[PDB]
Specification:
Layout: E1 2-5, H1 8-18, E2 24-30, E3 33-39, E4 46-52, E5 58-60, E6 65-70, H2 71-78, E7 87-90, E8 97-103, E9 109-116, E10 134-139, H3 140-150, E11 156-162, E12 165-171, E13 175-181, E14 195-198, E15 202-207, H4 208-214, E16 223-228, E17 234-240, E18 243-249, E19 254-257, H5 260-270, E20 276-282, E21 285-291, E22 297-304, E23 310-312, E24 317-322, H6 323-329, E25 339-342, E26 349-355, E27 362-368, E28 386-391, H7 392-403, E29 408-414, E30 417-423, E31 428-433, E32 447-450, E33 454-459, H8 460-466, E34 475-480, E35 486-492, E36 495-501, E37 508-511, H9 514-522, E38 530-536, E39 539-545, E40 551-558, E41 562-566, E42 571-576, H10 577-586, E43 592-596, E44 603-609, E45 616-622, E46 640-645, H11 646-657, E47 662-668, E48 671-677, E49 682-687, E50 701-704, E51 708-713, H12 714-720, E52 729-734, E53 740-746, E54 749-755
Antiparallel strand pairs: 1-5, 1-7, 2-3, 2-6, 3-4, 4-18, 7-8, 8-9, 9-49, 10-14, 10-16, 11-12, 11-15, 12-13, 13-27, 16-17, 17-18, 19-23, 19-25, 20-21, 20-24, 21-22, 22-36, 25-26, 26-27, 28-32, 28-34, 29-30, 29-33, 30-31, 31-45, 34-35, 35-36, 37-41, 37-43, 38-39, 38-42, 39-40, 40-54, 43-44, ...
Helix pairs in contact: 1-2, 7-8, 7-10, 9-10, 11-12
This protein binds a DNA duplex (10 and 10 nucleotides) through residues 9, 12-13, 79, 83, 139-142, 144-145, 186, 188-189, 191-192, 218-219, 222, 334-336, 356-358, 650-651, 654.
DNA sequence: CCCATCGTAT
DNA sequence: ATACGATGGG
């Protein structure tokens, strides 16, 4: 047996389609192609795969062989090798195992993986039918969605077919939903058209669980054939060039929004901080008020009529809703669709009617209403000391960033100064924004209307619930009083979302691009948890050995890597990288990162600055005593030295790590061989040296004094490859009497990984 | 031109 | 399993 796909992606796309509902299947190979068939765990969902000869680039099957294998294992081997490589299945007349063989256009890379076959009882039932009461084909896209959606309402979906009508229906405890589509043919984009041939209407019901499995076949085809019958199992078929994948399954007040996205955005700001709320509807619009569990955060929404494309009310109605169930319905289908809220005189439930831009596509849902009491709420006239407004996206960042440090955030308002502060166990953090009016980008202006200084503390828990409404307005209004609740408002067109909140009672090294130091720390934060940052007049260096003592990480950042550098006195900054990460994530990758430390260091200062903005985010990490490591100065001669793209070396490692906990590197003349041999099967990657003038960063240099054959723990190599963010290339020095060297050369710096072979 | 969906990679 | 990128459709 020898069958090669032109594109390895194809075979991956096939396996992925049915790999989640079957653990073990048999592939019966014949002269006329490959075929497979299996059932799910419950044994009601039958899957059948047929791959004809014309589906391959080359197919040769000496003798009918049956290949039983575990899809989990196979799919792991299918993740390997670029999806543009030529995949080739090879099996002997009596196979102990099957051999997969990847090969790109060039001869540079050659991947050969082997999987161990199994003994399965396979009787391929080759059976389809001639007559289905109805037959239809729709984009597997639209279908996958329809199913994923109605699966939130019920455990059983229902398909109902009539002439020129396809109706999917679901009924559950929270509510019901029905999607009606009609047959149409698109001349310009046929891949979106809907075919329907009805010999006779059908009203079959199918378990949602199985449909959820079936829709995974969308990875093979842009379309999905469905054949229904009141006497036969339904046929869900995904066609592929010269073949197909089949799933056989046996049946069992009106307020209209121009954009549906608005209502979603509103509910999003509501949920997560409030459970259920009464939507009070009147002729002048809709209002809703809810408090959080602890009753310290009040949410006040007011939607004016002008916010609707069309709005009408005969009489005031109150709709009690569970925002969780509500958001489930709001999930689908399109954000741009026309949303409409219908309700009868004595509302037992509310009906949401989604309508696409296309006249054809329709979807309506019905949410069962709750019973909630409104009383009692009273808002005394509130006077505020300070009043500011700023880009919601900016305020959102500040909150999210500072939330990382403390469970409490402090807002301080002084004359022409707004200071956000958070103080936690690892260290503090303060962002200081300055009021300014900008003619260009006037939306990003920071207004301040202060009558008297204010110092208020809030639980980060609640500020994170407030920033949820940032999707409603470019800006956010903040009224702050010392005796009144803090008010956070998001302005809608003809409306608003308000949040009432109750207070609480409690060395100079400037990086050109902050992102640089961030990707550096990410390069070895997984290898070592605690590390000293020794700072000298010539730059920053760090040596660290993990607890296992097998890996040595050597960092070095030269002065030429900074936009500015000063060192009056050699300082050492012992830091917890896990802490340093949280802080490095806050500031922008483009912002200027300045490290500041006093002569007698107790803490380090990380300073994030903007280009033309007064905005300054200063952070502070608490240092800790880390005992330095014992340095071994080894000057030796390696057996072999190779350099390759760190992007390639990374893929190679991640691919083989799936097979074994050990990866063997074996250098021979003009050949580099990476081999992982695990239980499920052994995979092997073989690269060859070559130079490419046009693109030098794709070359592979290989100098060898003597063949090498070392094994490294995949656990460690997975950490070493994370330096691929620092350099396009990775240096590899290998020796039999010495630890391997993995080097990533930065600009005016480097990151060395000295790993010890097993 | 913008938005949504699907596929691929990490 | 999640995130990012690319392609297709509206």
């Amino acid at each position: 047996l020898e069958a090669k796909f032109e594109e390895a992606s194809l075979f991956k796309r096939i396996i992925d389609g049915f790999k989640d509902c079957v653990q073990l299947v048999n592939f019966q190979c014949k002269e006329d192609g490959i075929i497979a068939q299996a059932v799910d765990d419950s044994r009601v969902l039958l899957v059948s795969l047929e791959i004809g000869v014309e589906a391959f680039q080359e197919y040769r099957c000496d003798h009918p062989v049956t290949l039983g294998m575990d899809l989990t294992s196979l799919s792991k081997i299918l993740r390997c090798g670029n999806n543009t490589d030529t995949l080739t299945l090879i099996a002997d007349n009596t196979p102990d195992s099957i051999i997969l063989l990847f090969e790109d256009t060039k001869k540079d890379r050659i991947a050969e993986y082997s999987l161990k076959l199994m003994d399965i009882d396979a009787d391929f039932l080759k059976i389809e039918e001639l007559q289905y009461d109805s037959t239809l084909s729709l984009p597997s896209s639209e279908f996958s969605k329809i199913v994923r959606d109605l699966s939130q309402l019920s455990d059983s979906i229902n398909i109902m077919i009539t002439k020129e009508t396809i109706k999917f229906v679901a009924d559950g405890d929270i509510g019901s939903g029905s999607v009606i589509i009609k047959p149409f043919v698109d001349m310009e984009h046929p891949e979106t058209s809907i075919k329907l041939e009805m010999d006779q209407p059908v009203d079959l019901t199918f378990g949602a669980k199985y449909l959820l499995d079936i829709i995974k076949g969308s990875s093979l085809s842009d379309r999905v054939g469905i054949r229904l019958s009141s006497e036969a199992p339904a046929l869900f078929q995904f066609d592929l060039k010269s073949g197909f994948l089949q799933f056989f399954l046996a049946p069992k007040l009106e307020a209209k929004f121009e954009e549906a996205s608005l209502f979603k955005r509103i509910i999003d700001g509501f949920k997560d901080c409030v459970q259920l709320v009464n939507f009070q509807c009147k002729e002048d619009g809709i209002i809703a008020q809810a408090v959080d569990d602890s009753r310290v955060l009040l949410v006040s929404l007011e939607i004016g009529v002008e916010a609707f494309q069309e709005y009408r009310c005969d009489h005031p109605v109150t709709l009690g809703m569970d925002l969780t169930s509500l958001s489930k319905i709001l999930r689908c289908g399109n954000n741009t669709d026309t949303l409409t809220l219908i309700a009868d005189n004595t509302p037992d439930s509310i009906i949401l009617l989604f309508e696409d831009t296309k006249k054809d596509r329709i979807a309506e849902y019905s949410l069962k209403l709750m019973d909630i009491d409104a009383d009692f709420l009273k808002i005394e006239e509130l006077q505020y000391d300070s009043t500011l407004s700023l880009p919601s996206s900016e305020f959102s960042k500040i909150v999210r960033d500072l939330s990382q440090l403390s469970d409490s955030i402090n807002i301080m308002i002084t004359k022409e100064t707004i200071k956000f502060v958070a103080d936690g166990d690892i260290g503090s953090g303060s962002v200081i924004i300055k009021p300014f009016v900008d003619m260009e980008h006037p939306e990003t202006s920071i207004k301040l209307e202060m009558d008297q200084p204010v110092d208020l503390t809030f639980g980060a828990k609640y500020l994170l619930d407030i920033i949820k409404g940032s999707s409603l307005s470019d800006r956010v209004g903040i009224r702050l009083s010392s005796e009144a609740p803090a008010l956070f408002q998001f302005d809608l067109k003809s409306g608003f979302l308000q949040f009432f909140l109750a207070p609480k009672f409690n060395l100079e090294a400037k990086f050109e691009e902050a992102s640089l130091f961030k990707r550096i720390i990410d390069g070895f934060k997984d290898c070592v948890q605690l590390v000293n940052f020794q700072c000298k007049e010539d730059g920053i260096i760090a040596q660290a050995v993990d607890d296992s003592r097998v890996l040595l990480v050597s960092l070095e950042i030269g002065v030429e890597a900074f936009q500015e550098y000063r060192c009056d006195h050699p300082v050492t900054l012992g830091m917890d990288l896990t802490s340093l990460s949280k802080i490095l994530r806050c500031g922008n990758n483009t912002d200027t990162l300045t490290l500041i430390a006093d002569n007698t260091p107790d803490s380090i200062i990380l300073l994030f600055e903007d280009t033309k903005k007064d905005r300054i985010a200063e952070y502070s990490l608490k240092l800790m005593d880390i005992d330095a490591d014992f340095l071994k100065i080894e000057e030796l001669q390696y057996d072999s030295t190779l350099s390759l793209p760190s992007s390639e070396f990374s893929k190679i490692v991640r691919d083989l790590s799936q097979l074994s906990d050990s990866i063997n590197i074996m250098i021979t003349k003009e050949t580099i061989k990476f081999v992982a041999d695990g239980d499920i099967g052994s995979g092997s990657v073989i690269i060859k040296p070559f130079v490419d003038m046009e693109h030098p960063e794709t070359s592979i240099k290989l100098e060898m004094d003597q063949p090498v054959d070392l094994t490294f723990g995949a656990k460690y190599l997975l950490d070493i490859i994370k330096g691929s963010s620092l350099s396009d290339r990775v240096g590899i020095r290998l020796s039999s009497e010495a630890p391997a060297l993995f080097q990533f050369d930065l600009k005016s710096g480097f990151l060395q990984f000295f790993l010890a072979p097993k």
